[PDB]
Design a protein around this nucleic acid. Structure first.
Ligand SMILES: [Cl-]
Ligand SMILES: [Cl-]
Ligand SMILES: [Cl-]
Ligand SMILES: [Cl-]
Ligand SMILES: [Mn+2]
Ligand SMILES: [Mn+2]
Ligand SMILES: [Mn+2]
Ligand SMILES: [Mn+2]
Ligand SMILES: [Mn+2]
Ligand SMILES: [Mn+2]
Ligand SMILES: [Mn+2]
Ligand SMILES: [Mn+2]
Ligand SMILES: [Mn+2]
Ligand SMILES: [Mn+2]
Ligand SMILES: [Mn+2]
Ligand SMILES: [Mn+2]
Ligand SMILES: [Mn+2]
Lengths: 95, 84, 108, 99, 93, 104, 98, 78
DNA sequence: TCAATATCCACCTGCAGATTCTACCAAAAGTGTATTTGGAAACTGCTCCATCAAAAGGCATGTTCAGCTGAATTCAGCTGAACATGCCTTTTGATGGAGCAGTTTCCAAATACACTTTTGGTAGAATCTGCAGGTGGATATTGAT
DNA sequence: ATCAATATCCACCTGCAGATTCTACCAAAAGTGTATTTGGAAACTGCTCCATCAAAAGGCATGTTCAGCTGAATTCAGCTGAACATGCCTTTTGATGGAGCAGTTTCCAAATACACTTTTGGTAGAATCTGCAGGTGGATATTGA
């Protein structure tokens, strides 16, 4: 009788604090960030799905995400994106 | 309610001129106002036609902010700020 | 049983890794999703929001504000070649446009 | 005198003004009727979330501001300073909106 | 391996509209590409429609809406027509 | 008893249905979906061929080549629209010259 | 002792090439350009003989299209000769370089 | 190898595009555009080739790249 | 117009490079049973959308009046089309042969499931503070003389 | 080359409407415990992709000429900007009545799980033909006088 709806707000805010310790963000702005995150999520995942299909693969590995990033993101943003993704994943698999 | 008619003329020159100033236009031919209205109406009908189509497929009598956001995306005018 | 560690923290990510995994499933992009994909993708999304956030913050600082607003996101986005291209077909509500007047229009 | 700025002084003053802000330039109510009207012709007895209309306007206004930019560029190309229907027409054909 | 396409079907249809006419090899490829593209757009739009209404199944209704969102005026109407017609008769027996 | 025969179509209603379930579009597909779609596909195909043929004749030929397709596409407002961002290979462009360029 | 005025053979060319659908660039030079470009991304590659056609059809179609838009921009500036700037306005309004 | 695209060629193209008079500076300007177009389309194609883990770039790679770029091409695999 | 170039559109006509139409087979597709399950009817709580009322002011409308801008004209260097002429690079053609891209055939590592715990979010009240909206002296800019 | 007639700046100033802080349910994540298979390796195969390489023109640089074209420069009619005086209608603020949105149950009808039975659609082939290419002439379209 409530209907709780999800959002990335909690996370944007944590990242906002690492880059700008004491800066705030209005809700209109936070709304725009959620949009952004979902847009890119959708885009990455979409291209990824297509990549798997073109190759007869039934599963999406972090390898699909990576090529996807290379196709979707522009030059320097891609480098940085890819680096941090690989970092997160190799760190993850080290339990 | 009350018959809605000729509402495109509600988009006045002052406003069409303010939008052009943000577009950085310095001088405006008097024939521009009727062009804009025409263009605006064609743009709006398309976004609105797709939206209401989404509204009808979801079987509702209300056009939601999302119905529009999806309409805009279908048309390549992706909008950030109202959900989605 | 052992202590529950969120997959995010195992990756040193701020973004919800499990959320990203769940969504990769409900979205029907593939029949099955690997274990790192949500980690990789989540890292990226987190990295991208971090990038724009830094720019907007400076943009907020420039305008002498402490709270980011849509306009700061605009300036941030439109002034960076790359974020500008990534969001080239995106319209940011209440963002405005970059102050710009064609040279020829100026007085001589 | 009375004092009097020359043609284009206030025009550039306005550009500077409307580019420094983010407020919607069209009046809310008029925009709403137009919307409710256009929509009534596709499907009768519809209702709108206050925000669906706010979205619509954000989108229309951004749309036209970009249109004027391209327009304005087609006016500077024809070695002119005054935008005309002729200019809006070229911008839309090149954009593919109405080839 | 087996490389399937729409070459056969394009042709049967070609034979109806223009029995006395033939079709190039390249021209056939074009036709293939066409069918594949429209299929994708229709499928994709349909796919998204379901997701939005939190539906987990793609019926003929999503297909029809997708068609109404994708094809132009007259093209869409005839498409929908042909679409319900086919469904109706399929349901006959 | 071919599932297509029932719908009175040439296009493969079965193959299509296969292409749907396997395409990652939705968790599940409906009996009608393949039908409805395959018929929308057949329809559009006919339309292209119909007009392409007429061009085949007008060009005096008998076999439709890419050119006849492009002519059939770029000459129809609606097809041209639906295919506004597609390049028909070996199709050329429609004979058109800006009257401002004509002599005299 | 016989001479077609400037601009006439041209209209003949326009009419000719718009009538045809044959590729307009010398194949080899293209394939050579392609292969060279590809190198800067990954060495010792190989291209299906088709993959290079898909590429030519793509380019020429892009260019011919871009010339139409360009031509329009010249017309708009009251000229009749396409200038590098007419190409820039076109690409600028297309969103290719905005 | 870019200069391989002779001016006469560039003229035939412009001719198909309906151009009557061509400025001399265009030729280089057009070789710049052509270049960027190929770079982009190939940079994306090869990416597909290398994701497929291959040494051979296929029509489908080019095709999929064209779609990526918004230059959909019928007649070569889809 | 007249009339000499050059073109360009038709009018037939024969061989073969590609349509085609076959003969035959794995591989979908279709048939039959059992499951599983998706949401469509059927209610209902209640969020927020449609209308309204009333008032004051921010603005849209018209109007003058004339500063410039668009445009019509006039006027030539010179840039870029039309021809020729000189051959250099691109075609046309198998032909050889192996770099590769497929293609089965295992299976270990990786996913998917099915419940069972655990707990990181989200929907509200509390409690604050950026900063929006005024105020008004500087200072810059602008247009007059 | 100075003047005010304005517009643009900004440093303060202070409620108050949005944050931001603080708390309780849960609808997911996070564990284990089995089950299921995906998709790399290996072992070879038949396909193309890459080079040779030997002519052979077709198509491309250079040049020579000069015919329009694309810039300038002027000049002026008249259109669009800048101002004002009017007074209309968009804003603002709730106050209220419900239409219809959504959250929750309960299913038949509808789509999904295998496990065999059947053509169907695709390859590699023998059957066929539609145009491409050429060659002639005969109108066309140009362009000079
Ligand atoms: Cl993975
Ligand atoms: Cl005009
Ligand atoms: Cl159905
Ligand atoms: Cl230029
Ligand atoms: Mn109406
Ligand atoms: Mn059972
Ligand atoms: Mn259910
Ligand atoms: Mn002027
Ligand atoms: Mn080998
Ligand atoms: Mn907790
Ligand atoms: Mn918590
Ligand atoms: Mn302020
Ligand atoms: Mn002269
Ligand atoms: Mn005057
Ligand atoms: Mn009710
Ligand atoms: Mn058969
Ligand atoms: Mn012929």
């Amino acid at each position: 009788k409530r209907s709780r709806k999800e959002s990335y707000s909690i996370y944007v805010y944590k990242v906002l604090k690492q880059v700008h310790p004491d800066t705030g963000i209005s809700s209109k702005a936070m709304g725009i960030m959620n949009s952004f995150v979902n847009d890119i999520f959708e885009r990455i995942a979409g291209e990824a799905s297509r990549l798997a299909h073109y190759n007869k693969r039934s599963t999406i590995t972090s390898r699909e995400i990576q090529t996807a990033v290379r196709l979707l993101l522009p030059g320097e943003l891609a480098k940085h994106a890819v680096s941090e993704g690989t970092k997160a994943v190799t760190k993850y698999t080290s339990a | 309610r009350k018959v809605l008619r000729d509402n495109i003329q509600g988009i006045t020159q002052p406003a069409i001129r303010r939008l052009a100033r943000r577009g950085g236009v310095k001088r405006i031919s008097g024939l521009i106002y009727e062009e804009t209205r025409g263009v605006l109406k064609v743009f709006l009908e398309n976004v609105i036609r797709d939206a209401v189509t989404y509204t009808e497929h979801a079987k509702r009598k209300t056009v939601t902010a999302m119905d529009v956001v999806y309409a805009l995306k279908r048309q390549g005018r992706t909008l950030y700020g109202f959900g989605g | 049983r052992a202590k529950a560690k969120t997959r995010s923290s195992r990756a040193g990510l701020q973004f919800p890794v499990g959320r990203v995994h769940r969504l990769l499933r409900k979205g029907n992009y593939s029949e099955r999703v690997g274990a790192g994909a949500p980690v990789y993708l989540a890292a990226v999304l987190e990295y991208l929001t971090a990038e724009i956030l830094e720019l907007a913050g400076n943009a907020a600082r420039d305008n002498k504000k402490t709270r980011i607003i849509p306009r700061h996101l605009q300036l941030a986005i439109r002034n960076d070649e790359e974020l500008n291209k990534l969001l080239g077909r995106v319209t940011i509500a209440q963002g405005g446009v970059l102050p710009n007047i064609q040279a020829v229009l100026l007085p001589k | 005198k009375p004092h009097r700025y020359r043609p284009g002084t206030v025009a550039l003053r306005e550009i500077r003004r409307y580019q420094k802000s983010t407020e919607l330039l069209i009046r809310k109510l008029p925009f709403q009727r137009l919307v409710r009207e256009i929509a009534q012709d596709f499907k009768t007895d519809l209702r709108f979330q206050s925000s669906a209309v706010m979205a619509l306007q954000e989108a229309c206004e951004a749309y036209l501001v970009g249109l004027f930019e391209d327009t304005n560029l087609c006016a500077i190309h024809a070695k002119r300073v005054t935008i005309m229907p002729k200019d809006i027409q070229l911008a839309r054909r090149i954009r593919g909106e109405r080839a």
